[PDB]
Design a protein around this ligand. Structure first.
Ligand code: IPE
Ligand code: IPE
Ligand code: IPE
Ligand code: IPE
Ligand code: MN
Ligand code: MN
Ligand code: MN
Ligand code: MN
Ligand code: MN
Ligand code: MN
Lengths: 362, 362
């Protein structure tokens, strides 16, 4: 177990705690409390909950093989649920600001938060900042007396920082590094020389993999008091690997999955992003295809966007994706086997996370 | 002490630490390091440094009367400087996002960060988020082994949260509370019924007073290991009082101090903000002046803005400001006298902070 039901139930508790505290300590009025309730629901719910449920499933794995009083088992499961919501609220923060930064129109099948009629960008920027503050309010309330509090806060903040650095790498990925200058308007690259696997990998490593895979796996270990029982270098390597594959999927779906299924409308082509599709197309294309790509990439013009998507389709990128995927399967399986040496239970949790990631269709 | 020189010197050290870590741990390239260096300098420097120097001056007060080895004195002064930069970087974060939210054009005598040619709003939103992450990176690096670390992080996060709540109160201050609704476009108030002292005071309490006065005073106590030696209810009361007066000054200057001296261009009238000027004018005006105010407030139109400023000038608000100020002087002096009972040294630091605030011209 009922993991998803327990996790969703704890959302109601955290929300009530936060909103009750706003009334009792922060002098909030009922209508602004309602606004923040709706904001919380809209930005924190309706996703796949993969990050939060990873914390829960890692914790459940150790519960199955560790001797505990039932009260202790309930405490660990509750801590796992609260920690998972910390990551889901961190996600909510990033998506609110990212949708503004990327000029997006839909998220989770609804308008992006900033596009809601009674929201607008000026309030949505601050709403996003509130979401991140709530992660810390949660931590200090629910975990005040826990032995893992310091480790958890330190990990959370380093992951949050890495993600913000990665967002800088992402939103500057269509500029030439040598021309970056706050004082000079930034032209889009014309040579696309920095659309390389290594540079792509750096964006993804920081913007996605720490908070989507490393943070939930290690938080599950922390609330289980089990971190010392795994090889942390393997956790870092497998989180980076699965997290990169997760983003490659997201890049592919941005272009080729209908918004009806995906729940968002892709902007990577029009935004000139350094996506897996663009890097891989450039790793394959002949001279004429590169020049045609350059003539059309990074423009909102729906007909130029359409030229790019046809170039992608005719370049048979499904072949590159399959070879990349087959390589990731080898390496993920190898790392899971290595994890089994010290931590069979955690290895299985990583196998579950991989299976969920590998099979996802949104 | 040479307090200002020590404090500015520590900026260079923190900056080098942060940028060196970006190179050694976060795979940053030189041009993006340069961008973030310039971003740090532009957003963190050039203010009055009142918040950071409050930490230093509180710590210096206890140094003068406490027995310490010189090495311990140097450690406390360095911690005070690092903690002061934590608050200055928090300030930097708020100003970067606030200038976007308020549609402002100038800050500290230069263009707002988001208006720099090679910046733009999409990167500036994330740059602001980086500034806040840097406050935590600082804390965990410099204070990892300090006994005050947990208290400091908990205080910092609660203050940061209060400020974000206050920014919500601020950016929604021109809407009718009963009509707030994320799903419905928000009309500006027509009755201005929520332009009251009590509602004004709530905005200011949260958006300004916690991070501008409470946080620097208590951080000075924490790095001095002296918090138990003061009456914290008095610290809270005097921080709220001086912080409110500080914002009333800022509201007055928004309208009446030339940008050449102030270093920013006011937006409160055009933004329909609940400012001290608007609340006090409405506390004084006759029927015709209220209707003329309503006809002109909250519009970028330079001639409508000019109508409001003339209404302010003819309403003799200098009289209300002087009575308000005379009341604050009574109450601040009373709280300083009360603080002397347990903590003469801290009372004097608060007297210094008050004098600096009271005499400021920007
Ligand atoms: C890192 C990326 C690509 C952001 C979207 O993440 P998810 O696809 O996990 O979004 P939700 O399930 O939370 O909606
Ligand atoms: C949001 C973060 C931090 C990483 C994912 O970036 P994207 O910008 O690719 O995410 P989507 O908008 O595609 O979900
Ligand atoms: C709280 C307000 C009114 C923001 C500006 O603060 P300051 O007037 O202290 O700005 P700097 O000295 O840091 O430039
Ligand atoms: C920035 C914060 C959090 C409070 C001061 O608000 P203002 O919006 O009045 O500040 P200025 O732009 O006048 O400096
Ligand atoms: Mn996006
Ligand atoms: Mn993005
Ligand atoms: Mn995407
Ligand atoms: Mn402002
Ligand atoms: Mn403002
Ligand atoms: Mn102001």
């Amino acid at each position: 177990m009922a993991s998803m039901e327990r996790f969703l139930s704890v959302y109601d508790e955290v929300q009530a705690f936060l909103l009750d505290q706003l009334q009792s300590k922060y002098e909030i009025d009922p209508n602004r409390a309602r606004y923040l309730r709706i904001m919380m629901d809209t930005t924190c719910l309706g996703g796949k909950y993969f990050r939060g449920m990873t914390v829960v499933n890692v914790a459940e794995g150790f519960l199955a093989v560790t001797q505990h009083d039932e009260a202790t088992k309930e405490r660990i499961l509750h801590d796992a649920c609260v920690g998972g919501w910390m990551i889901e609220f961190l996600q909510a923060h990033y998506l609110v600001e990212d949708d503004i930064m990327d000029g997006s129109v839909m998220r989770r099948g609804k308008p992006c938060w900033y596009r809601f009629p009674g929201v607008t960008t000026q309030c949505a920027i601050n709403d996003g900042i509130i979401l991140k503050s709530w992660t810390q309010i949660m931590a200090w309330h629910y975990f005040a007396d826990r032995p893992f509090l310091k480790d958890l806060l330190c990990l959370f903040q380093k992951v949050d920082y890495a993600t913000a650095v990665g967002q800088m790498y992402d939103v500057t990925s269509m500029c030439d590094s040598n021309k970056l200058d706050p004082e000079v308007a930034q032209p889009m690259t014309t040579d696309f020389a920095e659309f390389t696997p290594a540079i792509y990998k750096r964006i993804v490593k920081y913007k996605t993999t720490f908070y989507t895979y490393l943070l939930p796996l290690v938080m599950g270990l922390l609330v289980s008091e089990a971190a010392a029982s795994v090889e942390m270098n393997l956790v870092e390597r497998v989180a980076h690997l699965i997290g990169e594959y997760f983003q490659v999927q997201d890049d592919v779906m941005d272009c080729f999955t209908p918004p009806e299924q995906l729940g968002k409308v892709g902007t990577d082509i029009e935004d000139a992003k350094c996506s897996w599709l663009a890097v891989t197309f450039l790793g394959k294309a002949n001279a004429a295809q590169v020049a045609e790509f350059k003539a059309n990439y990074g423009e909102k013009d729906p007909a130029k966007v359409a030229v790019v998507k046809r170039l992608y389709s005719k370049a048979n990128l499904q072949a590159d994706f399959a070879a990349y995927e087959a390589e990731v399967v080898r390496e993920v399986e190898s790392l899971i086997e290595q994890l089994k040496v010290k931590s069979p239970t955690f290895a299985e949790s990583v196998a579950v996370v991989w299976e969920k990631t590998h099979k996802r269709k949104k």
